[PDB]
Write a protein that binds this ligand. Sequence first.
Ligand SMILES: Cc1cc2nc3c(=O)[nH]c(=O)nc-3n(C[C@H](O)[C@H](O)[C@H](O)COP(=O)(O)O)c2cc1C
Ligand SMILES: Cc1cc2nc3c(=O)[nH]c(=O)nc-3n(C[C@H](O)[C@H](O)[C@H](O)COP(=O)(O)O)c2cc1C
Ligand SMILES: Cc1cc2nc3c(=O)[nH]c(=O)nc-3n(C[C@H](O)[C@H](O)[C@H](O)COP(=O)(O)O)c2cc1C
Ligand code: NI
Lengths: 185, 185, 185
Amino acid sequence: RKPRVLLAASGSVAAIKFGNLCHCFTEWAEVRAVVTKSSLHFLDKLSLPQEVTLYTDEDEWSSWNKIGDPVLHIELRRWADVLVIAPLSANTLGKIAGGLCDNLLTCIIRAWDYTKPLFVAPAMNTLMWNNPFTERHLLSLDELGITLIPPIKKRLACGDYGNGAMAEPSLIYSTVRLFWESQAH
Amino acid sequence: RKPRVLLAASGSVAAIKFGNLCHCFTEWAEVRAVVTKSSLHFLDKLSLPQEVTLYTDEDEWSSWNKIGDPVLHIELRRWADVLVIAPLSANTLGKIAGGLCDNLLTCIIRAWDYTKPLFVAPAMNTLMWNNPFTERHLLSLDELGITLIPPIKKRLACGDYGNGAMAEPSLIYSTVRLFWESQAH
Amino acid sequence: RKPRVLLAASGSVAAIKFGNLCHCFTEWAEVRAVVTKSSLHFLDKLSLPQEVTLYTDEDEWSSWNKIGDPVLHIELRRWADVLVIAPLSANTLGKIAGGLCDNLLTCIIRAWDYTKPLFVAPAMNTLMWNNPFTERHLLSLDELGITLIPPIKKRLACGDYGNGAMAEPSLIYSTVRLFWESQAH
Ligand SMILES: Cc1cc2nc3c(=O)[nH]c(=O)nc-3n(C[C@H](O)[C@H](O)[C@H](O)COP(=O)(O)O)c2cc1C
Ligand SMILES: Cc1cc2nc3c(=O)[nH]c(=O)nc-3n(C[C@H](O)[C@H](O)[C@H](O)COP(=O)(O)O)c2cc1C
Ligand SMILES: Cc1cc2nc3c(=O)[nH]c(=O)nc-3n(C[C@H](O)[C@H](O)[C@H](O)COP(=O)(O)O)c2cc1C
Ligand code: NI
């Protein structure tokens, strides 16, 4: 008990709320954060909880100097009871569906065992949300067992057809915590 | 009327004729150009029409400083009545079929609505043209609604089986203009 | 006779044995080596046979200055009777299955004709080996005609379910040489 939650941000404008999302999980769980290089255009590091360790692509090397040593993506994958990607960019979505491993975040996921819960809160402009790759990539992740926390539809301009703003932090948090408490530990 | 045509070059040796292709469209349409980083090994910037604005991956940041501001890939996608990729590299072809968004060009395409016409003129060495991923990726783009302007087969050494040199600018131009005039505006 | 063997390393910790693997092939064949940028974190250049030319992504430009000139990925693809990727990373595996061409190694492969033998010795941590993309990507490469030289299962901690350490150099070598001698030249 006291779940180990790995929170990740990818290169979406919604990464500006990532510090806030981290704040939601920290009383309840042990939180560690992973970010992509593009997410750093949108995230303020001083907005995170001070107790949260933020790992970047460069940390993949700071742990590993010689053969034997710990590999960070593998170490974070073993550590976690759950992984939450919020926001999940269109590009990261595609790289996960492509089975790629070119940075800390996709390499943790390419090492993933789908018996451990993995939640994603996609965040993208409505025109990317409605492009046919959104549904194809999310259907693939769904078949693998990922849990989609759907974006806010009718947000800001609506139109009613999907829309793509990231789910609110409070919903992402409650969805993961209610899951947990229904069972895992 | 006076169609807004987005012309793009990817990292093929045929990008050296991209300035010429731009010249073909400028009396008839409002033209804007997008290039990939690899295309700049092959394109001379002084060969473009002087009235054509060339956008690069770096322009994605020059428009966007703070939340609210215009995102260039989305802005170019809204602006365009049609998108023409000529040349279309094997790598860009694969990234489009993979639904990726890692630069201005693939992000415009990952935001695409296939009710708007999208034409591609693939350009690659015969050995890549004949590799089985060429047919698989082009069949996928075809199913989405892209329009292939086939490469020149029997060019330079022929052999008769595909061959891969980019379609001539005059054919790319006439194909897009005859389409337009048959209907869109 | 005296086969032309292209040996490649990708970004796996098993690339530290790449010099040794090269040594296995050099009396029997003409050997040329290709490496990815990530493989250079793990390979010592002084461990290669002195007669082996090592090509990197930067060599793609040192051959090509102007239109007409030789393109290295195409030149290496024509030269080779066989290609051996050992180690084959999870990321390279995914990029090959994605039909991408973003560096010397994937571009040689994206130009490949599967009538020429292509052997791969995957090397990855057990958790990536057991992730479902390993089997999906290897099934795709198999259908194309690639020859898998399976990783060592029961290695170091076993568990019995796959396991991922790269096949020993001696097995990779004997598998390719017995194939050759059964027929090609
Ligand atoms: C100003 C700007 C805003 C961006 N916003 C989004 C977004 O909200 N959602 C999305 O999917 N992509 C967005 N993108 C594009 C991604 O940042 C780009 O695909 C990036 O490669 C994603 O990298 P990552 O997935 O490794 O983090 C935006 C790009 C720019 C320049
Ligand atoms: C000298 C040279 C010539 C190239 N010519 C071609 C070509 O004609 N067609 C193609 O598909 N790729 C070609 N490539 C490989 C692409 O440039 C490489 O895949 C690049 O990543 C494509 O980037 P892009 O698709 O983002 O523009 C060539 C590479 C080199 C070094
Ligand atoms: C310390 C360390 C060890 C690595 N070991 C492996 C490995 O053994 N197998 C693998 O598939 N990936 C491994 N990776 C991840 C790859 O290096 C990373 O995916 C890289 O992008 C692969 O690049 P490449 O395929 O272009 O060479 C490791 C990464 C790090 C930081
Ligand atoms: Ni990439």
